[PDB]
Design a protein around this ligand. Structure first.
Ligand SMILES: [Zn+2]
Ligand SMILES: [Zn+2]
Ligand SMILES: [Zn+2]
Ligand SMILES: [Zn+2]
Ligand SMILES: [Zn+2]
Ligand SMILES: [Zn+2]
Lengths: 347, 347, 347, 347
């Protein structure tokens, strides 16, 4: 049943030729589950790990991927509440040390010794992948594993970002880039949380897509010359919360300007080198808070997946084979491929 | 009893010669109290009201001052819970429209129609001053009105700033400029709130004054070349909260680095023209929050004054007459003022 | 325009014959608005003000009523933020000091000197009624004043009760009596706040009504012998929050039993003489919290009325004349009334 | 060297003769540490496990004890974050599956398969004991293990109870039985958290011990006939929070009566069979919250032990050998035990 040989995309040298070759199957540890990855999502963090732009050293050779869904085919001799046949989801944090204030408090991502999938630990761009049982996401049975793969990163991130914004039901939330990949999920989650969504995006068929994902007010920045004034007129003042999915510095400056007094601006994107240069006087007088948000925790994962199971959050995805992931990586480096890409590891 | 003539410092033109001449005494309105200011504090905000640097227009001619304590000598025909002989304190916010969204949630400072003392309303650099009965602070009886004058602005500000850091008892709080005017009150309030104080100031007799105000760890920035390392070694892996009383850009830039993961940095000073240009990657990964803090509300006033009454907060002040304020303003513009200054309106 | 004679229901003696006679019109004070009540809601609290069951003494002769909507026809010489022609709503709290320790934190309903409508102050079972301008609710223009009258008490109460349960979006909330007058509004508000509603009521056409207002699971207590088991099975162990709109002791006991561990049970009804005798062991081991909720504050009023304006909360109610209120009171004392009753002060 | 034989107090039958005989030494599992218990605290929960009064079944034969401190002499092949020679503390909750609703949110005490020390798992009333490495408390090096043993249960309980009252620094906290074993630690922790302590205990030399622990006001219930009036006069009203360390019903009733409006009453004691029969009208009108608190989590343990290390919490204890525990149990059943008892496992 469990084979000795599998196949996956592995890069031996940083910024080398990503190769799809036969690799040895991993053996699970005492606290690890062996998961047969069925579908894996492709993210820009994968391109980052391939280049080596982030400060942490990358274990080489390594198979990338940090959003993979599959079936628990193997289990360690210490795993507690898992069974063979259960749906498991590999996330960015592939485990950490359960003995420090950070982890004990729930922020196990800020653990000094944290394992990351597709960076420090072999990821989900293969057929069989191992994962820490405690950090593995419990995907409900009867769910399409191709549609839940995109929510294993984007979904949890946007959900935790709204929780960090600290809004009440009936409050206005401005989402920059609301008709994009991370923006659409944000709009849906905010609508399911009881917030009034205001979307600022510009393009063809973007307004329609926003209104078809439960959109309230859409600001087209291509047809609007002043975005701050528009947001301040549509929300009887500023928006109580502003989720910044746009990495542009100009966008974040406008975000600090069109936020409501005593409001929160949440930063999600991480373009290494960017600076949120804003007027301190404005923030101090209007008592504005700028919060940075990273990956979500175990509880956040559970809650976001529950919304997906209820059927309030959806992601239109395009499924391709694992044998074509090299060319997908090249198009991702060229910045041309559009849409959430999910890779079938079977073919 | 209530005279018809009084004396105060009034400036007819912006940036003109401050004069000490006899002016008509104010008559109370329906919801206003007539207070006989006994002692008034001099702040750097008065120099700003004199120059016209801030954006709001100033009412001329006007008597400045926003921190004044005295006895209620007269009240209007609507004042509800005040009596003749009670001690009252005039603050920055001298009233607001109690009918809107902000004035109802407690943030009555963000009210569209707010009256500010020494800017839009006649202040307390006068013997008799009027104030809204709802925004006036209730100072307990038997208190020195000369020692409670400095706590009517600095005190409330630092207290709300330490309440905006979301800290728990036993947590580390770093205060930049801990041996200054605002920094000292901050240290005392944080010690009375159950926080471990770490002070970063440099000078002669500053370490001693910090250890004398219940200080726990002091970093001399004049004898230390790396402040971030020092803080991350003393406050274990960073300070849970950082109160920035220093207006220097370099200071706030270093503040965002010696903060613990998931911590908050509070901005109190407002040097119009300054910018907190920091790395976005760091804030998003460590999940740091930058919050701006302004003047406190009525509840905050009541709590801070209660600490002062218990006797856990003290301010060494120097008393001078009101006939000499015209020259104190010039020393304040030259930037030669060092300690807190309180003015006696009697002489 | 403002007449000298009006008509209203007044009772000279406690438990006397309610009469509909011509009474002098009230003259506004300095901080009070003169509202021409157009529609007024009848509550069970009016029967209590008529009997004298509650502990506070009633001002006689008095015109009852605490939920009335109308137009501002006159205002005092201190009112700030109101205009002639604006829609105003009289609530239970109709006066405060607004300068104490409970009036400065928002809990102005616990103020030592609080004025209550229909108890200590003349209420809204009158054509012209006066009210404090700071506590009066701002009803948006273009709204049916007959449908917003029931939401000026029931609505705010249920909303604050759902905000006191400390629930998150996607959490389970059990409402006892979900097909009643205070239960239906609760279901609607909880659905608009993002909570999953579970209703426990028994009768004919109640399950259907629950499915029309937006309820998820319905437990018929007449067809179910074990309600605790049913709730623990419909949810994944119990309901995160339980709103008790039923005044029965048995119901509140079963409520403490079918709550999730670390959950909150909110008490809204007040049958003087009732008791929640529950096992202390259970509450201490499962860390359950029993919170009591009273009338809402000004912020809560605004938020609840905003939901009503968006159109997510509705109340099926009729409109009987004020000349027939003397008989509605008798039907209310007999306990034979169905639905929410609204009285037209014009007829 | 780890021996093969040890000595401990084991009871084969429920309510049988506790014996001190040589028993086999436990072998650690994959995620468990082998601790050489040096000092162990005796609680009333041990007498409960001996009688079988609580509902859960006990694992016989069993060695009781839930508060034991010692050195890690052996660890499993999965333990991650511990070293040989580190000080470890065994608590009530040993270890549970970190995979459900209770573990992931921090409430790992409400887990379906939770292991309890001295009830379901062998406790610390022996020489060598095993414990889950994730639930074991990290005691700092250089600490007296005899003084930190009493703070491994009582301390954490009182700390979490004072954190469940939602109190601010400068607020009043009433502790019933402030001069007892669980009351003294409560007073000390509340003084270190910045709260004003009001103690209600009656006896000889109790007022002095309270004023020496850090208590502000003391109410002698033996010399006072009305306790509610006294607590309402000493706290300008009522206490913002009330920690009930007394198990009597009269005390808890008077507790709901002398709490401030919008305050919280925390229940810590668990006399199976008691009831807080209380008036519901009062709780609903004053918006009072009755919260139940159980054992603390990993984060709470860390924080409480940090206070003990700073030196702000102290417990006067009496050390006795383990060969005499068979008689201490009988004194505890007679209810004549005075002070906190700590047993030396060496003798
Ligand atoms: Zn990703
Ligand atoms: Zn760790
Ligand atoms: Zn100032
Ligand atoms: Zn306002
Ligand atoms: Zn009512
Ligand atoms: Zn114990």
């Amino acid at each position: 049943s469990i084979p000795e040989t599998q196949k996956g995309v592995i890069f031996y040298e940083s910024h080398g030729k990503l190769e799809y070759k036969d690799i040895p199957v991993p053996k699970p540890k005492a606290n690890e589950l062996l998961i047969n990855v069925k579908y894996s999502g492709v993210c820009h963090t994968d391109l980052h790990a391939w280049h080596g732009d982030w400060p942490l050293p990358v274990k080489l050779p390594l198979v990338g991927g940090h959003e993979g869904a599959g079936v628990v085919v193997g289990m360690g001799e210490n795993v507690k509440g898992w069974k063979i046949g259960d749906y498991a989801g590999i996330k960015w944090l592939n485990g950490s040390c359960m003995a420090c204030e950070y982890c004990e408090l729930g922020n196990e991502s800020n653990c000094p010794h944290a394992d990351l999938s597709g960076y420090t630990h072999d990821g989900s761009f293969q057929q069989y992948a191992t994962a820490d049982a405690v950090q593995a996401a419990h995907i409900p049975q009867g769910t399409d594993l191709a549609q839940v793969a995109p929510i294993l990163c984007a979904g949890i991130t946007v959900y935790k970002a709204l929780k960090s914004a600290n809004l009440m039901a009936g409050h206005w939330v401005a989402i920059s880039g609301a008709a994009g990949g991370l923006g659409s999920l944000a709009v849906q989650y905010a609508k399911a949380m009881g917030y009034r969504v205001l979307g600022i995006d510009g393009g063809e068929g973007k307004e329609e897509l926003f209104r078809s994902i439960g959109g309230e007010v859409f600001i087209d920045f291509t047809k609007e010359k002043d975005i701050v004034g528009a947001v301040l007129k549509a929300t009887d003042g500023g928006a109580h919360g502003v989720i910044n999915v746009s990495v542009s510095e100009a966008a974040i400056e406008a975000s600090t300007r069109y936020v409501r007094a005593n409001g929160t601006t949440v930063l999600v994107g991480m373009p290494a080198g960017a600076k949120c240069c804003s007027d301190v006087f404005n923030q101090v007088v209007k008592s504005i808070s700028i919060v940075g948000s990273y990956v979500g925790n175990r509880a956040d994962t559970r809650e976001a997946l529950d919304f997906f199971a209820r059927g309030l959050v959806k992601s239109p995805i395009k499924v391709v084979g694992l044998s074509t992931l090299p060319e997908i990586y090249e198009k991702m480096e060229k910045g041309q491929i559009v849409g959430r890409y999910v890779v079938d590891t079977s073919k």
